[PDB]
Amino acid sequence: IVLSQSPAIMSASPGEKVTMTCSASSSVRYMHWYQQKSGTSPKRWIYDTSKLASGVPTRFSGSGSGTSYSLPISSMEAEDGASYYCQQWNGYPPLTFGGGTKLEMKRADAAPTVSIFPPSSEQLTSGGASVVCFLNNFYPKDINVKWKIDGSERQNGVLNSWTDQDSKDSTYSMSSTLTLTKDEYERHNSYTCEATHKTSTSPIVKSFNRNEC
Amino acid sequence: VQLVESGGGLVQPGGSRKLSCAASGFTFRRFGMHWVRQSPEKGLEWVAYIGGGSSTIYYADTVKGRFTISRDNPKNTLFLQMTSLRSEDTAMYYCTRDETGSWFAYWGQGTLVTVSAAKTTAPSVYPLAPVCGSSVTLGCLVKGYFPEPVTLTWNSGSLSSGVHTFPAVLQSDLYTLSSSVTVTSSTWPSQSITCNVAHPASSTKVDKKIEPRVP
Ligand SMILES: CC(=O)N[C@H]1[C@@H](O[C@@H]2[C@@H](O[C@@H]3[C@H](O)[C@@H](O[C@H]4[C@@H]([C@H](O)CO)O[C@@](O)(C(=O)O)C[C@H]4O)O[C@H]([C@@H](O)CO)[C@H]3O[C@@H]3O[C@H](CO)[C@@H](O)[C@H](O)[C@H]3O)O[C@H]([C@@H](O)CO)[C@@H](O)[C@@H]2O)O[C@H](CO)[C@@H](O)[C@@H]1O
């Protein structure tokens, strides 16, 4: 039995109404909902389609019959942001789960702050070179980093990571690392971090020269 | 009501491991239990069901014949024994208590199971310090470690604001992780700031203290 949830991700501002969909391959015996806030186990939210778990707030509603069930919130809240999962039991294995709906919190556009860090002295002694770029507290989520050495773009050996939405800010941050051999790193003087975001037409640039530091 | 899973670790492909769930604060022999696992790639997947009697068992089509679920009622303990482990078996595993309608009211904290050929390796931690005035950003780079998870703390966890820790990314059998911390200029370098990284698998405990540098 296949449960299909749409949308995969959505953004809701505070004081907004939001609804989510689970679609079932075959008529379902039981439809349940869970809430997961990342880094913890999923929590019980709604059982038997319409019934609130003790401790869930009133705004949430559970509905639908047959093949289509829905989860809605009356008014969006900051605390509400989480992944929501639908689950079913038809009296026969397997018991089955949705892909899940990720609910982001909508907020004002923000521009990243960029920091570039040269390789550490210990790392050099160890015989390797790493350069890191931090892109901190920006919205919305999609973002680009480009690395330049001595004015020349390098796309190879770069790893990028994203946080989820910040607890207080509601923003995102990204981290970029460029990894070189020490000898190679010593080939070139200037290392540049270029970050491109929807906030600005022009990229935000940070750099250092291996000389001077 | 509490449920505590245990028995997780790093496992060889084709290996066998056993997990346990300890149940407290309810009449155990009364209820059915489930195993559920989660992977970021494939999310939430049901594994198996065992009745209060043990008379009724259900197995996920994927785990059939390689996994056996059992319970010990006097103990209050739930068991999942895994054999012929594959890469797809890598997940976080939760024990759950079955309720009418078969929804789960109570979940365990989980144990992480990783199945890989790759060798255990300890992280090397590098402090990241600003290059040569109204704010300061610092970083810890933790790289070349297998497997997850690592724990990064700042100042023993005393410092928790303006902290970003980024999920690890795995390249060629090794994970890279980083963290950035932002504090006011009066704060650093005047008062001390340190990066504490813990790798359980290697038993590694390491501390790096950020130092301004110049030659
Ligand atoms: C995965 C699945 O299919 N789960 C469904 C299953 O739930 C199981 C069920 O087990 C009960 C339990 O062992 C016990 O019932 C006692 C009490 C109960 O403690 C509180 O209501 O209920 C009675 O008073 C009653 O009204 O029947 C009887 C009490 O003795 O005993 C019965 C036994 O007759 C089993 O031999 C048992 O019910 C059967 O369980 C088997 C599973 O082995 C199932 O296949 C049969 O169809 C059932 O008739 O109920 C437990 C309960 O606390 C929560 O549902 C649950 O933990 C067990 O997993 O059956 C549920 C009820 O039909 C259903 O909601 C689940 O989806």
Task: Describe the 3D structure.
The complex is a heterodimer of chains A (213) and B (215). Chain A has 213 residues and is mainly beta. Chain A has two domains: 1-107, Immunoglobulin-like; 108-210, Immunoglobulins (Immunoglobulin-like), CATH 2.60.40. In chain A, 4% of the residues lie in helices and 49% in strands. Chain B has 215 residues and is mainly beta. Chain B has two domains: 1-118, Immunoglobulins (Immunoglobulin-like, Sandwich), CATH 2.60.40.10; 119-215, Sandwich (Immunoglobulin-like), CATH 2.60.40.10. Chain B has strands at 2-6, 9-11, 17-24, 33-39, 43-50, 57-59, 67-72, 77-82, 91-98, 104-107, 111-115, 124-128, 136-145, 151-154, 163-171, 174-183, 194-199, 204-209. In chain B, the strands form four sheets. In chain B, strands 2, 4, 5, 6, 9, 10 and 11 form a seven-stranded mixed sheet that branches. Chain B has a four-stranded antiparallel sheet with strand order 1-3-8-7, with no helix packed on it. Chain B has a four-stranded antiparallel sheet with strand order 12-13-16-15, with no helix packed on it. Chain B is elongated. At the A-B interface, strand 5, strand 10, strand 12, helix 1 and strand 13 of A face strand 5, strand 10, strand 12, strand 13 and strand 15 of B. A molecule of 5 linked components (KDO-GMH-GMH-NDG-BGC) binds next to loops of chain B. The PDB classes it as immune system. The entry lists the keywords immune system, lipooligosaccharides, antibodies, antigen-antibody complex. It forms a dimeric assembly.
